[PDB]
């Protein structure tokens, strides 16, 4: 079993670093974020050294940080994709979950 790291993970793969708090995701499906890859859910940083570390902020495939992070119809529930949905028409949750310059993901 993977040992989730302490909350406060800082995602600085890009110019806009975001802190991920597993605590706010411990109730999520560890397989929904680290979906089953290579036959096993890669329980490692989303932008692993060759996973979502694409700084093109345009790769709309399964190998671009931005995409999986701002896209919704992704192989799995993405960051903003699970956010726009975890908000349930909640301008308050939509500004915190999907809010880019005024949410929790982009303090
Ligand atoms: C952090 C916990 C992660 C999140 C959030 C996501 N991933 Fe990944 N990821 C990887 C591959 C090879 C794919 C595609 C799998 C396939 O269909 O063969 C994906 C895909 C996504 C997507 C959607 C991509 C798309 O729609 O094109 C999202 C939104 C996504 N992942 C979120 C590989 C990896 C990986 C390799 C080591 C890791 C650690 C992660 N993904 C982590 C996350
Ligand atoms: C990409 C791997 C992720 C990052 C970076 C963040 N999330 Fe999420 N997230 C989810 C829920 C259910 C919540 C709480 C909703 C609520 O109670 O209002 C959150 C919250 C956050 C926050 C702020 C929360 C806080 O400050 O306490 C940040 C900064 C954040 N998330 C970043 C759910 C999901 C989810 C569903 C599977 C996914 C894939 C992600 N979050 C991904 C990321
Ligand atoms: C999405 C809501 C997630 C769930 C559910 C889980 N993890 Fe996660 N994890 C997520 C992100 C955004 C990142 C990287 C953020 C960054 O700062 O780059 C990670 C990272 C990890 C790591 C660190 C990478 C490493 O050193 O291997 C570990 C250790 C990890 N995640 C473990 C883990 C476990 C055990 C989970 C289930 C309890 C789990 N994560 C769920 C996003 C999400
Ligand atoms: C939290 C679920 C997010 C929301 C809502 C938005 N973005 Fe985001 N963005 C998120 C993460 C985890 C990251 C990477 C953190 C890091 O710095 O490593 C980003 C990054 C960006 C970037 C950086 C692009 C790059 O330099 O490669 C941009 C340009 C960006 N985000 C834009 C953006 C927009 C337009 C959004 C509103 C829909 C938005 N983000 C929301 C997480 C989240």
């Amino acid at each position: 079993a993977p040992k989730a790291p302490a909350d406060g993970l800082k995602m600085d793969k890009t110019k806009q670093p975001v802190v991920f708090n597993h605590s706010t995701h411990k109730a999520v499906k560890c397989g929904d974020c680290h979906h089953p890859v290579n036959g096993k859910e890669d329980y490692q940083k989303c932008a692993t050294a060759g996973c979502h570390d694409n700084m093109d902020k345009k790769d709309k495939s399964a190998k671009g940080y931005y995409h999986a992070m701002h896209d919704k119809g992704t192989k799995f529930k993405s960051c903003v994709g699970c956010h726009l949905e975890t908000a349930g028409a909640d301008a308050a949750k939509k500004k915190e979950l999907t809010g880019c310059k005024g949410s929790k993901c982009h303090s």
Side-chain angles (χ1 to χ4, degrees):
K3 307 203 112 171
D7 315 315
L9 232 142
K10 257 205 216 139
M11 263 191 137
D12 41 76
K13 280 300 194 218
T14 47
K15 267 108 179 229
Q16 270 147 259
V18 165
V19 175
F20 179 63
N21 242 238
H22 275 108
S23 145
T24 351
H25 300 89
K26 300 195 307 174
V28 169
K29 245 94 174 155
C30 282
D32 231 322
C33 277
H34 292 292
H35 46 84
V37 162
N38 198 166
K40 46 183 242 136
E41 283 158 49
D42 285 58
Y43 300 107
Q44 57 196 160
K45 272 150 62 240
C46 303
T48 339
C51 230
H52 287 305
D53 195 15
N54 116 301
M55 303 297 107
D56 218 329
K57 310 148 55 216
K58 76 99 132 165
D59 166 61
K60 258 279 266 160
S61 255
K63 215 256 249 176
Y65 214 36
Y66 212 98
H67 171 69
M69 297 254 138
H70 305 95
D71 284 54
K72 311 112 61 99
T74 39
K75 210 57 239 268
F76 304 105
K77 57 188 54 170
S78 21
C79 295
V80 165
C82 201
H83 272 204
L84 232 156
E85 282 268 280
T86 276
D90 178 355
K93 265 185 185 114
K94 250 218 243 176
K95 79 107 182 229
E96 70 175 43
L97 303 197
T98 60
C100 339
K101 294 154 64 233
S103 83
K104 290 266 224 210
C105 226
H106 272 329
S107 323

